[PDB]
């Protein structure tokens, strides 16, 4: 029996890790541990650790860490509280593997804690490029302190190998979140229509825009005749906009508070195009044959493919892309969890492999 | 007037950083800040902050962090205490740059603290390899979180560039500590003997052994037994660092001291002037410290390097690599018996003439 602990610090990355957790839990020779922390214990986002429990999981260790503040000083303090809790949490859990996804500072924290305490780290989504204040640097630091690496694409695996990781320790397995696409039983147009009191049978745009003046977006959709607009929630700067557009056209736009992964993929499935700058637009929309118009550069650095139509944040260049989207796989198909588990079962990665020099 | 804050966690790195610190203090266009922490405030490692102050430097911010419990979980907790202190220290200092040397866990802590608080990091001694310690992965993580890089050799600079750092931010300026060869006057055998009440005129090994932190079950008896098998030489020890697993080494050192009181000198921490004075006259530098492969060859003193803590570093012909094995150590010892300094100024003018306020993009190799 191998103890596989999954680290989770936000609702979104828990969503991405969901099916790997389900598979470990189901697998009889693998014991699932869960270390939940950071924004799962934030009242701003409704204590999303409860969602983990409601989905059938047992939170093995929980570590409140986030300070109620907006300063970066308080982010450093939050990271310190995190390290203090992670020491005792890893001490009690004694995982054989710690699964860490992404590049948030609490994942950096737990990764270095694991390194010091000799818990092997399996890192997901290393080798990626997504410019920010410093999210990139942190991602690569996590890569350097991890023992095995599950990249989502070949460019990413190659960049991980350039970072000095042994090729036998890097695996292109696809994007784990896309397992949802492969395992969801989608709601029909009738079911979605009855559930949200809205006729999804008249085609629509699904639009998730996240805050990076968003005017040349909401002036860019008023022009598009004869389409309904289903929004998810991204904030008052854009929420106020979305609401203004609602009141102007009270019927042919629907704003939904929280879709949920199943309903969300069902509405995204039956859409002409995913509009906006969310990450859904650069992985889930391609896997669901629905074109994407990505706005601005919040998703700058992610790999592209046929379906992606990137346009700057101005009115005209958007209004063109919408119609062009009314005029019609590197991250994989969605069996990533099983590939990850097969590699974990068949590979020794207890120790950090020797640094890999190119040549 | 640019604010250059120098981070210092241990004696070792402080001595390495000395001439850079003194040159910034002396340079009237740069304001020296110092963030001292970790082993500088532990009585078990000498309270070496006193050395910093006595050298004429002002400790702008101090952060005690080291937990006394000798476990890996206590090391993690020490790093967390570090972060909680560095938050306020860096908040007040508002440095224009933070200078971080090396690969220890407190340096990882302060580097991520500075990154999160948008304080550019100048990292010294990146691109090297020390496979036997978790300092290895720490070092590459610190490289990825640093803005400008000062390496000690072209091989190391090249490894920094492979790590995805922009070429114009990686500089080969040499090892800063070796500036002590030209600018620091060495003590003589008589002054060392009066200063430590121990005769340095008799042949002696200088021994420094730290926990090899990737080794699962470190048992250091083969070294000390090996030392006991030698005749007519003295054993002068510095203390192991604060990594988990050091109290075992301290225990073995105290056992050896009680066994051979007239032949053993245990010093928690020398001044680096004193330390280089002792190393220069030793029969050999025994142990697994980084001085065995930079300072010790530079002073023409043979090195007996034990284990894998220094595995991967550049070698030369006076480096004797052995396993943690009684016979290999005894024989390397029997052999040992029987038988350019402008780095600081280069770093300073690079920091003066370069803009590294923002992390440069990831450098993909062709
Ligand atoms: O009402 C909603 C809106 C979004 N999502 C999910 O939230 C995830 C993250 O969305 P987004 O791309 O906006 O995150 P970001 O890219 O901004 O980090 C996606 O996988 C969606 O499936 C959801 O479950 N319900
Ligand atoms: O008692 C000592 C021992 C070390 N040093 C300095 O620290 C460096 C490295 O020694 P140490 O074992 O403490 O560090 P590490 O092996 O971890 O690099 C040497 O080159 C010396 O310049 C010192 O000043 N006093
Ligand atoms: C700082 C110090 O005292 N010792 C060494 C230093 O010589 C070396 O270059 C560095 C590698 O990053 O690792 C430190 O442990
Ligand atoms: Li299971
Ligand atoms: Li000065």
From TrEMBL, chain A:
Protein name: GDP/UDP-N,N'-diacetylbacillosamine 2-epimerase (Hydrolyzing)
Residue positions binding N-acetyl-D-glucosamine: 125, 128, 139, 279, 302
UniProt entry tagged with the keyword Transit peptide: no
Annotated positions binding UDP 1: 11, 210, 259, 279, 298
NCBIfam families documented for this protein: NeuC_NnaA
InterPro entries: UDP-GlcNAc_Epase, UDP_GlcNAc_Epimerase_2_dom, WecB-like
Residue sites binding UDP 4 per the record: 210, 259, 264, 279, 298
Gene Ontology molecular function: any one: UDP-N,N'-diacetylbacillosamine 2-epimerase activity
EC number: 3.2.1.184, 3.2.1.183
GO process terms (BP): UDP-N-acetylglucosamine metabolic process
Keywords annotated in UniProt: Glycosidase, Hydrolase, Nucleotide-binding
UDP-N-acetylglucosamine 2-epimerase domain residues: 23-345
Keyword Iron in record: no
Taxonomic lineage: Bacteria, Pseudomonadati, Pseudomonadota, Gammaproteobacteria, Moraxellales
